Amino acid sequence: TAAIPDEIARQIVLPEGHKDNVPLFEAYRWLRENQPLGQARVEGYDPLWLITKYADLMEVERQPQIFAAGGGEDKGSNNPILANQAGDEFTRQLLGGNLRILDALPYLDQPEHSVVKDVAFDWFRPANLKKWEDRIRETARASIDRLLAGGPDLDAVQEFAVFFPLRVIMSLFGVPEEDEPRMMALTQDFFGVADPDAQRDDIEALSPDAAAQQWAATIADFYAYFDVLVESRRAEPRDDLATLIAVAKDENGEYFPKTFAYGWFVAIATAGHDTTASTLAGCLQSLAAHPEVLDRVKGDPDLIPDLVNESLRIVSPVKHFTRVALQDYEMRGQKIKAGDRLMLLFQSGNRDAEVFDRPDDFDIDRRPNKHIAFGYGPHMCIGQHLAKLELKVMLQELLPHLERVEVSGEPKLIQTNFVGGLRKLPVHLTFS
């Protein structure tokens, strides 16, 4: 019934606690074993129930009428992405009393969430992504040719893994190649709001609300760019994802307000490539640690989807979203009160020993691989089938060219409690 111990709560809640995966995953493990559903009360944050168990993540996510993303009828009364209190106070000054800074899926509750998701639902289904496989494969091949020409010594992240998923999503989206560097810079600003190596020059870096200022500044740069793209596709439609979203109309034949298109476009321009790059880099890191796995998948390319699934489980680069209890609710002997916020810890769910035998082991032979790296419930990752296709296609093209991966310098993680993974993986490759 007590609060979570401060040292454990701080390790998970504070962005600084994610700088090193070792103490972070030991804090998740301490909770799952000792206090699987407790309230973290960290100075400068709202109290948060830390949802550490696989079964609890599904129980919460499958009941959106109880556990809201955006606050329910009081729209924008909950921030789905954990800011500190000072940050949420900054946002309420910016927006005038609420926290809905984007009109994007994570901020929405049903039935609004369903109406908006219906715009892109079919586009993201596996059968509808098949039309892109050959173009993704040509992109993967172009990226691997540059890797082979560049020699065996590189940062597998900033000199390889980042470019492929960015080129794929910008090509599908319909953004020209020359705009990719600025999209990459803004994605770094967006997911780097609390990382001292990713600070924007235009906001206060050390203010209590610094991360919320960076988030808003980054969004404003996206809105400027996307407003031009929305008016462009409304005036002259193309066969691209920018058009599908730009021209989308409601049941009354009115365009959705432009901010809905901007919200899609922000999610696509950031989430649409960064986590794909992280998972690919974490895959290479695991192949360095488990060379027998690389030998096996080179011997049987049909194992590549299993390798992708186990990489998603181990890397789990999307660490949380938040929810708010719309009513009192009992779970695992604890009384969650109406108004209480919850932090869904997907990386912890993915190490739950009740679900996964030897959960810290890299084992591609888990079948089925029950991972929750894409979440659950109506907010389950809409991009997951695009991500899995890109990772499958890259590893089908790449792994024949790799005899060995060696990590030849210190890996670096993005310092974030939100969307993380490797920003640096110095390697020495042996080409086949």
Which positions touch ligand HEM (CB under 6 A)? 61, 105-106, 117, 169, 267-268, 271-272, 275-276, 279, 312, 317-318, 321, 346, 373-377, 379-383, 386-387
What, of ligand OCc1ccccc1, ligand HEM, none, does residue 82 touch, CB below 5 to 8 Å by kind?
none
- Tell which positions 401-430 bind ligand OCc1ccccc1, by CB under 6 A: 419
Q: How many CB atoms lie within 10 A of CB 220?
A: 12
* CB 315 within 8 Å of CB 372: no
Select the span of 267-275, 284-292, 350-358, 398-406 touching ligand OCc1ccccc1 (CB under 6 A).
267-275
Name which of 264 and 356 has its Cβ closer to ligand OCc1ccccc1: 264
Name which of 151 and 257 has its Cβ closer to ligand HEM: 257
Q: Is 41 annotated as a binding residue?
A: no
What, of ligand HEM, ligand OCc1ccccc1, none, does residue 386 touch, CB below 5 to 8 Å by kind?
ligand HEM
* CB 420 within 8 Å of CB 21: no
114 contacts ligand OCc1ccccc1 (rule: CB under 6 A) = no
List 161, 382, 389, 391, residue binding ligand OCc1ccccc1 (CB under 6 A): 382
Name which of 248 and 407 has its Cβ closer to ligand OCc1ccccc1: 248
Residue written as tokens 């390889």?
A: 160
* CB 242 within 8 Å of CB 229: yes
124 contacts ligand OCc1ccccc1 (rule: CB under 6 A) = yes
What, of ligand HEM, ligand OCc1ccccc1, none, does residue 385 touch, CB below 5 to 8 Å by kind?
ligand OCc1ccccc1
- Tell which positions 271-310 bind ligand OCc1ccccc1, by CB under 6 A: 271, 275
What, of ligand OCc1ccccc1, ligand HEM, none, does residue 419 touch, CB below 5 to 8 Å by kind?
ligand OCc1ccccc1
Name which of 152 and 377 has its Cβ closer to ligand HEM: 377
User: Which residue's beta carbon is nearest to the bound ligand HEM?
Assistant: 383
Q: How many CB atoms lie within 10 A of CB 409?
A: 12
Q: How many CA atoms lie within 13 A of 17 on its CB side?
A: 19
Name which of 294 and 389 has its Cβ closer to ligand HEM: 389
- Tell which positions 321-380 bind ligand OCc1ccccc1, by CB under 6 A: 380
Q: Is 381 annotated as a binding residue?
A: yes
Structure tokens at 138: 């040509």
* CB 343 within 8 Å of CB 320: yes
Closest distance of CB 294 from ligand OCc1ccccc1, Å? 27
Q: How many CA atoms lie within 13 A of 62 on its CB side?
A: 7
Name which of 17 and 263 has its Cβ closer to ligand OCc1ccccc1: 263
Closest distance of CB 306 from ligand HEM, Å? 15
Name which of 5 and 106 has its Cβ closer to ligand HEM: 106
The CA distance from 102 to 100, in Å, is: 6
Closest CA to 311 of 289, 291, 282: 282
The CA distance from 231 to 227, in Å, is: 6
Per-position DSSP letters for 188-256, written without gaps between them? HHHHTTT-GGG--TTS-SSSTTHHHHHHHHHHHHHHHHHHHHHHHHHHS--SSHHHHHHT-B-TTSPBP
Residues forming a β-bridge with 236 = none
Q: How many CA atoms lie within 13 A of 89 on its CB side?
A: 10
Closest distance of CB 419 from ligand OCc1ccccc1, Å? 5
CA distances, 270 to each of 183, 190, 312 (Å):
8, 8, 18
Select the span of 4-12, 133-141, 264-272, 331-339 touching ligand OCc1ccccc1 (CB under 6 A).
264-272
Q: Is 283 annotated as a binding residue?
A: no
Q: Is 371 annotated as a binding residue?
A: no
User: Which residue's beta carbon is nearest to the bound ligand OCc1ccccc1?
Assistant: 271
Per-position DSSP letters for 45-72, written without gaps between them? S--EEEE-SHHHHHHHHT-TTTEESS-T
The answer to whether the peptide bond before residue 23 is cis (omega within 30 degrees of 0) is no
* CB 229 within 8 Å of CB 262: no
Select the span of 142-150, 159-167, 270-278, 335-343 touching ligand OCc1ccccc1 (CB under 6 A).
270-278
Q: Is 428 annotated as a binding residue?
A: no
* CB 87 within 8 Å of CB 214: no
List 106, 152, 208, 305, residue binding ligand OCc1ccccc1 (CB under 6 A): 106
Structure tokens at 14: 């504070």
The residues that touch ligand OCc1ccccc1, with contacts defined as CB under 6 A, are 106, 121, 124-125, 267, 270-271, 275, 318, 380-382, 384-385, 419
Known binding positions for heme b = 113, 323, 376, 379, 381
